[PDB]
Amino acid sequence: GAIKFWDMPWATPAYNDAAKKIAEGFSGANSKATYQIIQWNNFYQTFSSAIASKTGPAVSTGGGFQAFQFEEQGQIAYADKVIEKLKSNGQFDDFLPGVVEPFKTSKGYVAVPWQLDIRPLWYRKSLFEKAGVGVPTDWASLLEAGKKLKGVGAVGFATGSGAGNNIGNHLMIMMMLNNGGGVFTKDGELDVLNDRNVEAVEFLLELVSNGVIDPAAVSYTTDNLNAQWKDSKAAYGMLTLGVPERVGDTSGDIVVASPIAGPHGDKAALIFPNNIMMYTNTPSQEASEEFVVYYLGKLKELWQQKLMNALPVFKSITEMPEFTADPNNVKIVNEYVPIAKTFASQGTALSANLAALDGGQALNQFTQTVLTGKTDAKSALTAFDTGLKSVLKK
Ligand SMILES: OC[C@H]1O[C@@H](O[C@@H]2[C@@H](O)[C@H](O)O[C@H](CO)[C@H]2O)[C@H](O)[C@@H](O)[C@@H]1O
């Protein structure tokens, strides 16, 4: 009977309360939807195991590239009919340019975009003032300012890789991208030991050895990391859109910082093309489709209530008074969006291999190794390369 919708803890608990009410409001196709929260820790395995044992949902959000893995396994339901319905009802024309096309394959649309989770740098003005330093413009200035911030008891580059916390993972890849590197070649081949990647990892290790990265960062959960921001421990670091609201400190002291240049002049921001996906295990495919169209139509309410930690994929939402009046949001649009790249870099096309990269053990372990300075850059990257070859399909 009921359409099962699984959703992640995208922002604050209040995000899930609101998304629950939206979902449970669905009464289309003489059908209903149930809402269930899947935790971030081990999410890849949670979905993989549910789908394989036929106990998974009809519809879900989840990993940025998860839909490609399940499509390869033949467990996704293509979203072509949803796309048609959005064209008829008018919503399709409201999509931002380039947001739908990444999901088009030979066999259909694997999913529908719903938000863009971008990785801005943030700072706390009071702590930069206290340390007597300026906002970094590049890696060399990040390190200098970081040392001074450490000297006044602050964390110069806040991150975390504890259970449920993927921000550390994202930092590893963001810094590679920021130095003109990336996991892949232009043609989508693995290129982990590229020299720009080595430099990026050497820089992170230097932040770790100098105490600019907190020596316990490896252990920090999402709550731990948010608390560092809320309680004026974190001076600078990479997080998400809407950090003040996410951490419960809207004094105005926490502000978006400009992107910084790598040592060769490169600029990049990391972005995740998040999407809603439908599965073959549904009591009714028509109902899955109705639910998805209904849900996309109500998404504006989440940005209206300022409950999201991501960019919208709909033009009308990006023009909503609540969105543009926040200068942090405008700075992200203007300075991060134009330089944004995904995990596919230096390729562009998305694929199932991104699912294994994003959700798998190799990236997690690489991150924890770097954040503890357990080994040298080349060794860590070689272990990373090797782990990815074990799971990616060449
Ligand atoms: O790498 C796994 C997934 O990470 C998602 O980002 C999440 C943030 O939006 C949220 O605020 O924090 C959690 C826990 O750290 C993050 O995992 C990406 O948006 C996904 O695309 C990605 O699959």
**What residue type is assigned to position 276 of the chain?**
I
What tokens appear for 133 in the block? 């330093």
Q: Are residues 190 and 284 in the same domain?
A: no
Residue carrying structure tokens 């991501």: 310
Find out whether 220 and 302 touch, Cβ atoms under 8 Å: no
Residue carrying structure tokens 């995740």: 272
* CA separation, residue 70 to residues 107, 113, 180, 351 (Å): 13, 16, 31, 11
Q: Are residues 5 and 35 in the same domain?
A: yes
Q: Are residues 72 and 146 in the same domain?
A: no
Q: Are residues 265 and 142 in the same domain?
A: yes
Q: 115 — phi, psi (to 5°)?
A: -165, 165
Nearest CA to ligand 1 atom 16: 166
Q: Are residues 287 and 324 in the same domain?
A: yes
Mutate to test the pocket of ligand 1, among 272, 332, 342 (most ligand atoms within 8 A of CB): 272
List residues bridging with 105 in a β-sheet. 108
Cis peptide preceding 346, ω within 30 of 0: yes
- Data resolution in angstroms: 2.0
Nearest CA to ligand 1 atom 3: 63
* CA separation, residue 26 to residues 109, 272, 338 (Å): 23, 27, 36
Pocket lining: 167 vs ligand 1, CB cutoff 6 Å: yes
Q: Are residues 304 and 333 in the same domain?
A: yes
Chain centroid, CA 58 distance in Å: 23
Q: Distance between CA 114 and CA 263 in Å, rounded?
A: 34
Mutate to test the pocket of ligand 1, among 117, 225, 274, 341 (most ligand atoms within 8 A of CB): 117
Pocket lining: 288 vs ligand 1, CB cutoff 6 Å: no
Q: Which of 332, 347, 362 is the last residue before a domain boundary?
A: 347
Q: Distance between CA 36 and CA 50 in Å, rounded?
A: 13
CA of 89 to the centre of ligand 1 (A): 31
Q: Are residues 370 and 242 in the same domain?
A: yes
**What residue type is assigned to position 37 of the chain?**
I
Spatial neighbors of 141 by CB under 8 A, at least 6 apart, are 134, 260
Read off the CATH number of the domain in which 376 is found. 3.40.190.10
Q: Tell me which residue of 114, 94, 198, 213 sits closest to 160, measured CA to CA.
A: 213
Q: Are residues 190 and 328 in the same domain?
A: no
- Reduced to 3 states (helix: H, G, I; strand: E, B; else coil), residue 50 is helix
Nearest CA to ligand 1 atom 10: 10
Find out whether 32 and 2 touch, Cβ atoms under 8 Å: yes
List residues bridging with 254 in a β-sheet. 124
Spatial neighbors of 193 by CB under 8 A, at least 6 apart, are 378, 381, 382, 385
Q: Distance between CA 242 and CA 236 in Å, rounded?
A: 15
Q: Tell me which residue of 177, 228, 213 sits closest to 347, measured CA to CA.
A: 177
Mutate to test the pocket of ligand 1, among 12, 115, 161, 166 (most ligand atoms within 8 A of CB): 166
User: What is the number of domains present in the chain?
Assistant: 2
Nearest CA to ligand 1 atom 17: 166
Q: 105 — phi, psi (to 5°)?
A: -125, 170
* Domain carrying residue 242: 119-270+348-394
Q: Are residues 142 and 39 in the same domain?
A: no
- Reduced to 3 states (helix: H, G, I; strand: E, B; else coil), residue 33 is strand
Q: Are residues 259 and 382 in the same domain?
A: yes
Q: Distance between CA 343 and CA 270 in Å, rounded?
A: 8
Residue carrying structure tokens 């924890």: 368
Q: Distance between CA 233 and CA 369 in Å, rounded?
A: 23
Other beta carbons within 10 Å of 26: 23
Find out whether 244 and 11 touch, Cβ atoms under 8 Å: no
What tokens appear for 157 in the block? 């580059």
Q: Are residues 88 and 170 in the same domain?
A: no
Q: Distance between CA 61 and CA 277 in Å, rounded?
A: 6
Nearest CA to ligand 1 atom 21: 64
**What residue type is assigned to position 292 of the chain?**
V
Q: Tell me which residue of 381, 388, 383, 309 sits closest to 354, measured CA to CA.
A: 388
Pocket lining: 289 vs ligand 1, CB cutoff 6 Å: no
CA of 63 to the centre of ligand 1 (A): 7
CA of 154 to the centre of ligand 1 (A): 25
Q: Are residues 341 and 353 in the same domain?
A: no
Pocket lining: 369 vs ligand 1, CB cutoff 6 Å: no
